[PDB]
Amino acid sequence: DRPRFSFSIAAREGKARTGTIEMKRGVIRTPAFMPVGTAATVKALKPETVRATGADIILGNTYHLMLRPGAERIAKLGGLHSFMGWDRPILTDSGGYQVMSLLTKQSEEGVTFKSHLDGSRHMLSPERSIEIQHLLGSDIVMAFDECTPATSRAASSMERSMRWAKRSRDAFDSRKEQAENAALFGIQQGSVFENLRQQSADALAEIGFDGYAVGGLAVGEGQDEMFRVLDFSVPMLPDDKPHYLMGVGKPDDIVGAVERGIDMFDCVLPTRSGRNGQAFTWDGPINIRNARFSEDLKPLDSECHCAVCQKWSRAYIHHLIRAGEILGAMLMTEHNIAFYQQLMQKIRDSISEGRFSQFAQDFRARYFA
Amino acid sequence: DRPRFSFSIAAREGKARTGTIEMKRGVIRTPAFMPVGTAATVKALKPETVRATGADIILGNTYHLMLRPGAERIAKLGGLHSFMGWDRPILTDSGGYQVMSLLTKQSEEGVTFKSHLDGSRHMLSPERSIEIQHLLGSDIVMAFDECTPATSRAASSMERSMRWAKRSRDAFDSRKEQAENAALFGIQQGSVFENLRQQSADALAEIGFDGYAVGGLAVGEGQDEMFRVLDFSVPMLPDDKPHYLMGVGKPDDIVGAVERGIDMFDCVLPTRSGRNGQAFTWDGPINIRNARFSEDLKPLDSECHCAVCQKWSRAYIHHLIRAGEILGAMLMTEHNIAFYQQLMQKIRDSISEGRFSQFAQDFRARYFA
Ligand SMILES: CC#C[C@H]1NC(N)=Nc2cc3[nH]c(NC)nc3cc21
Ligand SMILES: CC#C[C@H]1NC(N)=Nc2cc3[nH]c(NC)nc3cc21
Ligand SMILES: [Zn+2]
Ligand SMILES: [Zn+2]
C-alpha cells in the first residue's frame, strides 16, 4: 500500500525546497506545476500526453463540474478519474473563487448563485463543496472560502473564510472514505495586509491541514506586489507542509515564488495561450503566427525535449495556427505544457544540487534578453 | 529498393478485387480508404494516430496548398511529407474539382480564378497542376481535368478533360524525377451517359496511366444513380490497374462500390461528421450529443478495436462534444477513421476468403436494422 499523504523535503536552498508528496494514486515531485483541466479535460490533450510531458497531478474545478456534467452524475459513472481517464492525483478547487469570477448572494451559510451556463440557480457551502469533491473522488480537496481590492473589508472576508475552513475540516473528517484516502488543504487570505495574513495563518494552523494554499493572488496585482506579499506570507505557514500558490503563473512568477517558499502551482497560461499562438521558449515567449516564422524550419525551442520539437517545424505550426487547424492547438499545447514541466524539473534539480540561485539568475538573463 | 508503382491483385470475387499497390514510400492495401488531409493535416489527428488507425495513404489537395501555404514554399521547406510529418504515400487531387467547387474563367488553356481565401487571382492548367504536385512531392499525381447536371454539354467537358489528360501525361513524363518516383492517374468523365464514359475510358487507355479514377460522382446524385453509373463505367477501365472512386463515401456506398470493382476511396465524412458529433458503428451511425448517451458507459462501438473504444465512454465523449472541447473532436475523429479502416480490412479479408458477398449482406442487415 501507499500513504494517504506524506510530504518529505529532500533539499533546501534559502527559502526554496524540493521533495515529494506521496499519495495513493502516485507521487508528486515538488515544486510541482498542475495543468488545468477545468471541464474534465486538459484542453486539446489526451491524459497520456499530459503524463508524457511530465505532469504528476492535474487540477479540476468544483464550480464547473457541478454544473456540467454534474457531481452526482460523475459519481454514478465511477468518479472523475475513470470518467476522463487520468488515474493519478487530482486536486480540485472548492468553488469559492470561480463562483465570484464567473449573479451571487453571500451569507454566513454560503453562496447562492446563477450559472453562467444555464441561468439555473445553485448553492455552495463548505459542506456542499466538500461533498461535491467527495463525489468527484478528488485526491487533494480544497477548503471552501469566501472571495471578493478591499479596505478593513478584507478582514471580514478573511474571518468568514476561516470559519468556513473549520466547517470544511469537519465535513471532510465526517466522511470516512474521504478522510482515509484524500488530503485537505486550507486557504490563507488577508489580501496585501501582513497582520491579516498572520491572523489567517494562525487560524488555519490551529485547525490543522495537510497543506496550505496562498489565496488572493494572480488577480491582477503585478509581480512586485505579489512577491512582496509572498515575502511575509509564506513564512507564516507551517514549514513542514506544502505551500500552494493558486493561479500562478508566468515562468518568471513561478521561479520567484519558489525562491519565496512555494511548492505547488497551477495556471491556464500554457494551455490557453498555446491555443492563441504563444509558445514558451528559453529565450522568452514567441507568437508563432508572426510572419517571421513562415519558413523557419527550427523547432519551437532549440533545447526542448518534447515530441513536438522532435518532429515539427515552426513553419508548419505557423501554418496550422494561421489556418485555425485543431492540430495547431494540440501541438502548441503539448509543447507549452512540456516546457512548464521542464522548467519545474530544472528548478527541482538545481535546488537538490544547491545551485538554484545561479539557475534563477541564468534563467532570467536569457529569458528576458 | 522498392518499386515506383506495382499493383498486384491477390484475389477476386465477382467484380470485387483485393491486393496491394507497392510504392517507394510504402505498401497500400486495396480496397483502400484515404483519410483527407486538405490543409496538410488530417483534421484533429497527428500523423502517427492516422497510421495507428490503419491508413496506408492520405489525400492532399493542389488547390488548397497552392493558396496556403504555397507550393514553392512547401518545396523549399523540404516537401509535403516532411512538412506535415507523414512519410508514407500521398495522393494529391489536381485542383480541377476544387477550383469549380470553391469566380472562374475557363478556356482550352486552363482556368483563371479568384481564391475563396484571399480574393487573390490564380491560374491552373495541366502543366501548372503537374508542376505544383511535383513541388509538393506527391506519390500519386492526378491528371488535371475540367469540371462542371449537364445536357450534350457533358461531352464538351469530357472531351476537353481528355485533351488535358494527354497534356498532364506529357508534363509528368517531361519531369524525370517525377516520372521515376511517382505515379499518374487519369480521370474518367462523361456524367451519367454510357457512351461518353466509353469514349472517355478509350481516350485514357490510349494515353496510358498507372491508375484510373471515376470522376463526376459524389456530387449529390443519390446512391441508386451512382451504382447505375458504376455498373457500366468501371468495366470500361483497364482491369489490371487500380480504380479510384473520388469523394465516396458513406460505408454503404463503399461496400457497393467494391462490389462493382472500385479499389480506392476518399471522403471527408468520417473526419467532418466526427467533429459534428456523428460516430459510426456496426449498428449504424449515432449522434453522440443526444441526451440518451449522457450516462452511457459503453464505448462508441462495442466491437471496435480503436484506442478510443478501449479507454473512454460514450458518456464522456457526449460531455466533451456538448462542451465544445477539442478532445471531443480528437476522439470522435480517431474512432471514425479507425472504423473506416476496420471496414476496409473486413472487405479485404472477406474477398480474400471468397465470402465478400456474405459479408456485404450481413453488413447491410445489421447496419440498417
Ligand atoms: C482570496 C482567494 C483565493 C483563492 N480561493 C480559491 N478557492 N481559489 C483560488 C483560485 C485562484 N485563481 C487565481 N488566479 C487565476 N487566484 C486564485 C485564488 C484562489
Ligand atoms: C467530373 C469530375 C471529377 C473529379 N475530378 C477531380 N479532379 N477531383 C474530383 C474530386 C471529387 N470529389 C467528389 N465529391 C466530394 N467528387 C469528385 C470528382 C472529382
Ligand atoms: Zn517542445
Ligand atoms: Zn472505436
Q: Report all structural domains of chain A as residue ranges with CATH numbers, in order of start.
A: 1-369 (3.20.20.105)
Sign of the Cα torsion A98, A265, A78, A170 reads negative
The residue among A211, A238, A259 whose CA lies nearest residue A18 is A259
Report the side by side order of strands in the sheet with B243-245.
Answer: B32-34, B264-266, B243-245, B211-214, B183-188, B140-142, B90-93, B58-61
Contact A50, A341 (CB under 8 A): no
Output the DSSP codes for A184-240: EEEEE--TT-HHHHHHHHHHHHHH--SEEEE-S-SSS--HHHHHHHHHHHGGGS-TT
User: For the range A306-311, what are the long-range contacts, defined as Cβ-Cβ under 8 Å and sequence gap of 24 or more?
Assistant: A306/A53, A306/A334, A306/A335, A306/A338, A306/A339, A306/A342, A307/A52, A307/A334, A307/A338, A308/A332, A308/A334, A308/A335, A308/A338, A309/A335, A311/B85
State the residue for C-alpha cell 462500390. Answer: B257
B289 touches chain A (CB under 8 A): no
After which residue numbers is chain B interrupted with C–N beyond 2.5 angstroms?
A: 102, 148, 151
A191 Cα nearest atom in ligand 1:
1
User: Chain B: residue nearest A42 by CA?
Assistant: B327
Cis amide leading into A31 (omega within 30): yes
B291 touches chain A (CB under 8 A): no
Q: Which amino acid does the sequence have at B330?
A: M
Which residue among B41, B312, B329 places its CB closest to the CB of A320?
Answer: B41
From the CA of B66, how many Å to the nearest CA of chain A? 13
Cα(A193)–Cα(A290) distance, rounded to whole angstroms? Answer: 43
Cα(A139)–Cα(A21) distance, rounded to whole angstroms? Answer: 12
Q: Which amino acid does the sequence have at B184?
A: L
B322 touches chain A (CB under 8 A): yes
The residue among B39, B19, B40, B22 whose CA lies nearest residue B30 is B19
The residue among A328, A350, A227 whose CA lies nearest residue A276 is A328
Output the DSSP codes for B306-342: SHHHHH--HHHHHHHHHTT-HHHHHHHHHHHHHHHHH
Report the side by side order of strands in the sheet with B26-30.
Answer: B6-13, B16-23, B26-30
Binding-site residue ranges of A: 93-97, 145, 189, 216, 304, 306, 309, 335
Say how many Å lie between the CA of residue A342 and the centre of ligand 3: 10
Please enumerate in sequence order all residues whose Cβ is within 8 A of that of B339, keeping only pairs 6 or more positions apart, or say none.
B270, B279, B280, B281, B301, B304, B306
C-alpha to C-alpha distances, B36 to A321, B24, B59, B64, nearest whole angstrom = 19, 21, 5, 12
- Could you give the residue ranges of the DSSP H alpha helices within chain A? 47-52, 62-67, 71-76, 80-84, 96-101, 126-136, 153-173, 176-181, 194-207, 223-233, 251-258, 269-275, 307-311, 314-322, 326-352, 356-367
State the residue for C-alpha cell 488572493. Answer: A216
Residue B29 gets the label, from left (phi > 0), alpha (psi -120 to 50) or beta, of: beta
Cα(B209)–Cα(A166) distance, rounded to whole angstroms? Answer: 80
Q: Can you read off the three cell numbers belonging to residue A87?
A: 488515474
The residue among B47, B4, B11 whose CA lies nearest residue B31 is B11
Contact check, Cβ <8 Å, B330/A40: no
Q: Can you read off the three cell numbers belonging to residue B166?
A: 494527354
Say how many Å lie between the CA of residue A343 and the centre of ligand 1: 23
The verdict on whether B93 is a catalytic residue reads yes
CA end-to-end distance (rounded Å), chain A: 49
Residue B348 gets the label, from left (phi > 0), alpha (psi -120 to 50) or beta, of: alpha
B295 touches chain A (CB under 8 A): yes
- Could you give the residue ranges of the DSSP H alpha helices within chain B? 47-52, 62-67, 71-76, 80-84, 96-101, 126-136, 153-173, 176-181, 194-207, 223-233, 251-258, 269-275, 307-311, 314-322, 326-352, 356-367
Provide the chain B residues 11-70 that lie in CB contact (below 8 A) with chain A. Answer: 39-41, 43-46, 68-69
Residues of chain A found within 8 Å of residue B69, distances taken between Cβ atoms: 294, 315, 319
Helices A251-258 and A223-233: crossing angle, nearest 10°? 20
User: For the range B77-80, what are the long-range contacts, defined as Cβ-Cβ under 8 Å and sequence gap of 24 or more?
Assistant: B77/A295, B77/A297, B77/A313, B77/A315, B77/A316, B78/A297, B79/B136, B79/B137, B80/B40, B80/B136, B80/B137, B80/B138
Experimental technique of record: X-ray
From the CA of B63, how many Å to the nearest CA of chain A? 15
Report the side by side order of strands in the sheet with A90-93.
Answer: A32-34, A264-266, A243-245, A211-214, A183-188, A140-142, A90-93, A58-61
Q: At residue B213, what are phi and psi to the nearest 5 degrees? A: -90, 150
Report the side by side order of strands in the sheet with A6-13.
Answer: A6-13, A16-23, A26-30
Catalytic residue, chosen from B139, B210, B253, B266, is B266
Contact B217, B246 (CB under 8 A): yes
Please enumerate in sequence order all residues whose Cβ is within 8 A of that of A11, keeping only pairs 6 or more positions apart, or say none.
A17, A18, A19, A351, A352, A354
Pocket lining: A146 vs ligand 1, CB cutoff 6 Å: no
DSSP label of B143: P
Contact B349, B341 (CB under 8 A): no
Please enumerate in sequence order all residues whose Cβ is within 8 A of that of B42, keeping only pairs 6 or more positions apart, or say none.
B35, B36, B50, B58, B271, B333, B337
Catalytic residue, chosen from A56, A93, A210, A263, is A93
DSSP label of A325: -
Residue of A49, A272, A326, A332 for testing the chain B interface, max B β-carbons within 10 Å: A326
Q: Burial-class residue B295 by CB neighbours within 10 Å (0-12, 13-18, 19+).
A: middle
Report the side by side order of strands in the sheet with B111-114.
Answer: B104-106, B111-114, B121-124
User: Chain B: residue nearest A83 by CA?
Assistant: B316
Contact A240, A201 (CB under 8 A): no
B78 touches chain A (CB under 8 A): yes
Residue to substitute in B94, B97, B101, B185 for testing ligand 2 pocket (most ligand atoms within 8 angstroms of CB): B97
A323 touches chain B (CB under 8 A): yes
The verdict on whether B239 is a catalytic residue reads no
> What's this structure's resolution in Å?
1.7
Contact A221, A245 (CB under 8 A): no
Contact A241, A5 (CB under 8 A): no
User: Chain A: residue nearest B328 by CA?
Assistant: A44
State the residue for C-alpha cell 446524385. Answer: B221
User: Chain B: residue nearest A84 by CA?
Assistant: B316
Cα(B158)–Cα(B170) distance, rounded to whole angstroms? Answer: 19
Q: Which residues partner with B266 through β-bridges?
A: B34
Closest Cα to atom 4 of ligand 2 = B215
3-state percent breakdown (helix, strand, coil) of chain B, nearest 5: 45, 20, 35
Contact B45, B337 (CB under 8 A): yes
Residue of A45, A46, A80 for testing the chain B interface, max B β-carbons within 10 Å: A46
Cα(A155)–Cα(A148) distance, rounded to whole angstroms? Answer: 11
